[model samples]
Target chain A: STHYLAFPRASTITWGDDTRYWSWATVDFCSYAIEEARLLQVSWLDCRWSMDASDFKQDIWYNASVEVMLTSNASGWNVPLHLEIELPDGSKQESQIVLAGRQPNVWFKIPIGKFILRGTSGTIRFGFYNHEGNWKRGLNIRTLAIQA
Target chain B: STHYLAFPRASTITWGDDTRYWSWATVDFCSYAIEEARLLQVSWLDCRWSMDASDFKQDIWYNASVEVMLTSNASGWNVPLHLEIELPDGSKQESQIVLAGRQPNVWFKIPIGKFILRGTSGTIRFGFYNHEGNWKRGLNIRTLAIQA
Candidate 1:
């Protein structure tokens, strides 16, 4: 089973309300819905979500990812964003993804990491972050997904 | 004038006292001295230095950099480390550097950013960081440099 949490469901997004950095937009290619969070321009990128471990079946491995699209005019992404997933037990899985060279205007998934659902009921958190002072523009986030 | 602060002068280093993550070693090629911090293996890398703005001449731009060298057997540096400098007034300059492909055993400078001293007389801070869960190895830190 796959669970899709739309962009609006994100727990926190830096500058989500600031029009200079982000804004709401409608895109047809998004799987979850037409509404998405569009990146206008920003140097510090951070978006996070939290979910309960009990939402998944026990003893199963699950992969988490973010669904995003880069507009044709996107720029200043020479530095890759760091992706991290923290399990209920305090262990974390981490990786980095470069978005500069990806094809534009097409929705794609950037994998965060994978983890097995243990019996313990606790919160699992994951997010993307890049605090470097390079302005980035023209990216759209549709959803966060967890698949077994 | 150029100011050189050796590795031992760092204000803070995560796991600095942990033998598993870091240790003190001697290298003759380092400009500062024979003793330097040697990275053994770890996922989280952080080393910071701080200085008083009064130490630098006012109205002059200074370049901040970290002197380091990768060992031939270094591993797990696919993700680049973020470099940041925070000036006295809270303004920041940031960049990222990839260490995986650099020539090993040769000391070199990783430019953080350039900032002009404005005579604020507050603390200026800078550091390097990468928290991805990939164990990195064989890196040597010689010193931090501030050059006009």
Candidate 2:
């Protein structure tokens, strides 16, 4: 299937609203599907102002967007946004569409003991860019759900 | 919902073998679904960075411009992108609307000869900092469809 251009962050966004939220229940691990679309994206936007210029402020403007571009390394080996993965214990997940535009702050979280994902204590098929949440971006993301 | 974000700009993008691309799309200017969704977005994104700073080149500012930061003065006073809505119909061909930011060159735009919004027509919204490609930051922004 065509890599419909989607990714699941399962991460949430919060800026003093007090309340927090969780993102949709899905996992998207499209390998290399988000590495080449860096046309106009900046490299120092990881929340920590590692690179500073006398003209630019290290503190990103309030509400400043955290942008992420998507493309493939394989050139033609595209990955769809609807890929799915199921664990042995019956836990399952799927992918979602990732459009290029703008929206609001997103947040994420996983249940404490839900076993959303489990390992066999052995090696299995592994890849980068969404094979799991440990590869830089996300396992889950959504709005900062309010504790109220 | 709460919308809050930064560095909005305009540039070029393509989708699925689609020849004709878009310069603009009427979306939620101030979507109440999320907090601070009112502010329009302008930015660029590159996912090639190492996440550790290898896949991307250095950050550059050019072609486009805008930068802004405002304090909440009781929440009633709005920082409107009024340049687009106040143009006297049949004004000029192209003009640049700027919203001052903390940095040197940070801004977005309205297309040329947009439907002249008049009498408090600019939408007031919350903002966001999403990285799902919902909103992207970039260089080379054309003026919005409103007046300068």
Candidate 3:
């Protein structure tokens, strides 16, 4: 059964709601991977993909579907707001699990990882909240699994 | 106050029930972005993403709180079945947007482009129906933008 997870709706505020961690009002999402399970699909998250200049984002996949977070119907055929994936190994990847609207929204404190998760015990923890633009709250986040 | 936008819901079809393009489904959710500007909250149409592991049927973002003609809540998400975005370049992007109990089910189709926006476009085509996926779907998918 699918479900709808809500962030702090009011976006947990500090004083007068000055700002959020990454500026994004967020929540936590989890998926289980048993003997052989990949994140078949995620249910709720919003990112905006913008088709700016290069068909760069377009050239990557050829007649295939991938995991991502689409922000709006205004989402260009190629534009999206997002949570860029930076890996622990220091590699950079782009997944649409983030928001790229007027403001910049990001997901779990996952400093790095892939959306179409793989590997044994592949777990991911992230934060989603409000942002000013392309930036998160002043306080960066860390997940319980990754923090230890 | 939260305001949501439902597209005019253009031409619609059932999954695998359409035409030779039985393998594909499209919807004209062209007003997604505009809605985002209003509700001040993430719109379901914008909640699109995918997960194709080179061995999956790769779900697209055609499902929504409103099922144009298909009853795909079987999984518990009121998704539109499946929707793809076809550009003027003859290239297309497919997506699947579903809402569940704290799940992330948003994605797009990248058959011949990057993950975000950088492709060409004149008009797009979509549907609540799409071709089923086997395994080769993931191999054919693009990347999931992650944290940078």
Look at candidate 1 and give me any clashing residue pairs.
none
> By the lDDT metric, which is better: model 1 or model 2?
1
Q: Candidate 2 — which residues are off by over 4 angstroms?
A: A1-148, B1-56, B62-64, B67-148
Q: Which candidate tops TM-score?
A: 1
lDDT of 3 at A45: 27
Per-residue alpha-carbon lDDT of candidate 1 for residues B6-123, written as tens digits (9 for 90 to 100): 3443347788889878888755431112457888888888887766564455787778777788988788777988999988688889888888878899988888999886534666
Question: Which residue segments of model 3 deviate by more than 4 Å?
Answer: A1-83, A86-148, B1-25, B30-66, B70-148
Candidate 2, residues A54-106, lDDT tens digits: the string is 11122322111123323331121122223223233434333333332223233
Candidate 1 Cα outliers beyond 4 Å, as residue runs? A1-148, B27-34
Residue A90 of model 2 has an lDDT of 36
Error of 3 at A86 (Å): 4.8
B-chain TM-score for every candidate? 0.88, 0.15, 0.25
For model 1 chain A, the run of ten residues with the poorest summed lDDT: A26-35
Report the CAPRI category for model 2: incorrect
RMSD of each: 22.3, 21.7, 19.3
